[PDB]
Write a protein that binds this ligand. Structure first.
Ligand SMILES: Cc1cc2nc3c(=O)[nH]c(=O)nc-3n(C[C@H](O)[C@H](O)[C@H](O)COP(=O)(O)O)c2cc1C
Ligand SMILES: Cc1cc2nc3c(=O)[nH]c(=O)nc-3n(C[C@H](O)[C@H](O)[C@H](O)COP(=O)(O)O)c2cc1C
Ligand SMILES: Cc1cc2nc3c(=O)[nH]c(=O)nc-3n(C[C@H](O)[C@H](O)[C@H](O)COP(=O)(O)O)c2cc1C
Ligand SMILES: Cc1cc2nc3c(=O)[nH]c(=O)nc-3n(C[C@H](O)[C@H](O)[C@H](O)COP(=O)(O)O)c2cc1C
Lengths: 141, 140, 137, 138
């Protein structure tokens, strides 16, 4: 059974991580190949580290703060956060986190699903830029 | 360190299913909540069935056949396919399958990951159509 | 030539061009270029000697017509986006700019209006806004 | 009257020029205030020059050549061309030219209509760029 759920995660293209919520600083104890391709970091450089290493220059500190609180309160969270690949390229990370609890209700882990939506959001920005330039002229008219 | 993967799959929004390659006609033995939302079918109405119940008259037979061949040859595949929700609502399904083999190298299951990319397909079509409209404001 | 050249210039404008007589009652159209004929679908016979309001229809924004009328009576220029209708009853968005025409004594004699169908650009916007619905949710 | 057309041309925001097809190098004999505002050149720096002075490094040679042909063949033409204002600021010129013949059928002038369509173009460019992006996704 379990073998097959692992292989399901291994098959997913989105980044999947599991962090240990009973160790200090919620270290990554698993990542899938999709996380390697998404971030540019091999697993050897991922395991045992907090995910915050993905953050960079323009990452929004408010979003990081909202994420921090969710985790410390053992709650799910779904944010869009600016992250950076190992090569320094920025990417927009549609990030979802969910707590894992055992039969006693003890928080043991977090799961995290990371999806690159750079292309999608970049297309919005350009479309909205073209469209704002138009509606501004219709405002004068 | 086994149920943690299950939970990870449970939280995946994209549809995830597992079919049993040993049982006849590859019955679905698992689907996450993501699949229930995608298809409109509660898991109780999904389990035990072949995924072809998502197909309908407008599904491209060439895509289906190509997929059938990959599965009979125990190979991975990736296809864009028209599916139907329980309510008949059509959608574009970005379907990727992967074989699962035990340590003996026997094929025991397929993993299926389905994403509704309807909005993405429409987005391109709409943006292309808009482009033409705007290009029409300038002769040449 | 001299006068005639400018005539061919005005005829070269693909954009609709009308000259209205600002002395005659009801500011009638005295001239319209071929571009205006193509835009509206009205031949020059069915245009010349009519007020341009014949282009307006059920959904035409009364506010826009009001701002447009004000400037005219005040011999001032104006630029508006207005819904008009073609002879075949087809609606179109009219990017309309009008300018007053004064003689050597500075007396308002005519108006000059330039019409451009921007229906395509509006349509494109509609298509983009529709494509953004998905993301916006 | 036909004196109307002239004063009308003087109001239009769009550029209007007349060139003499008989004189050497098709000089501009007339430009409206719109042409002055569009190009940023006072009419004294316009009249008696060929319109090519608006062209610059990024101007497409194929378009220029296509235009040159039509002018020598005494035909109409309609092109979209990159021009430069006096300040060195580029703009997209929708250029519509027509030949003016006399009663003999002899070519005497050209009428030029210049419209700044930069915004329209820049709109198309942003969409094309957005489409590259959204295509990646699929
Ligand atoms: C399962 C999981 C996955 C995470 N994935 C990411 C991620 O991909 N990118 C990111 O910037 N932060 C991610 N985080 C959040 C950070 O690891 C961290 O909790 C956050 O930056 C709080 O900052 P601080 O604790 O250093 O103040 C993830 C957290 C968890 C629990
Ligand atoms: C794991 C897995 C997931 C599948 N998911 C879908 C799906 O979401 N939609 C679909 O139309 N077919 C899906 N299929 C394909 C059908 O189950 C079936 O294999 C296909 O139609 C083969 O052709 P046949 O129906 O003629 O045998 C999936 C197959 C597997 C093994
Ligand atoms: C030069 C000129 C061009 C005009 N072109 C248009 C036009 O293309 N479409 C339109 O609906 N109204 C146009 N108008 C406005 C109408 O002719 C009219 O002045 C306006 O609707 C004023 O309100 P009324 O029609 O109720 O008097 C134009 C006016 C002028 C002076
Ligand atoms: C009426 C008229 C208007 C023109 N307006 C422009 C213009 O606005 N911008 C431009 O770059 N060229 C314009 N041209 C083109 C040039 O004047 C010239 O014909 C062309 O560049 C020929 O190539 P040459 O420069 O190698 O002689 C115009 C030509 C005519 C006849």
């Amino acid at each position: 059974r379990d073998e097959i759920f692992r292989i399901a995660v291994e098959t997913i293209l989105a980044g999947v991580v599991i962090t240990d919520a009973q160790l200090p600083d919620y270290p990554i104890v698993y990542c899938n190949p999709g996380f390697v391709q998404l971030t540019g970091y091999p697993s050897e450089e991922v395991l045992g580290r907090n995910c915050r290493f993905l953050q960079g220059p323009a990452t929004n500190p408010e979003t990081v703060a909202r994420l921090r609180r969710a985790i410390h309160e053992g709650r799910p969270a779904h944010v869009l956060l600016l992250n950076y690949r190992k090569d320094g390229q920025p990417f927009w990370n549609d990030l979802r986190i969910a707590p894992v609890r055992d039969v006693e209700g003890r928080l043991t882990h977090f799961v995290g699903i990371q999806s690159d939506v750079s292309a999608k959001v970049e297309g919005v920005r350009l479309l909205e830029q073209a469209l704002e330039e138009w509606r501004s002229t219709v405002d004068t008219l």
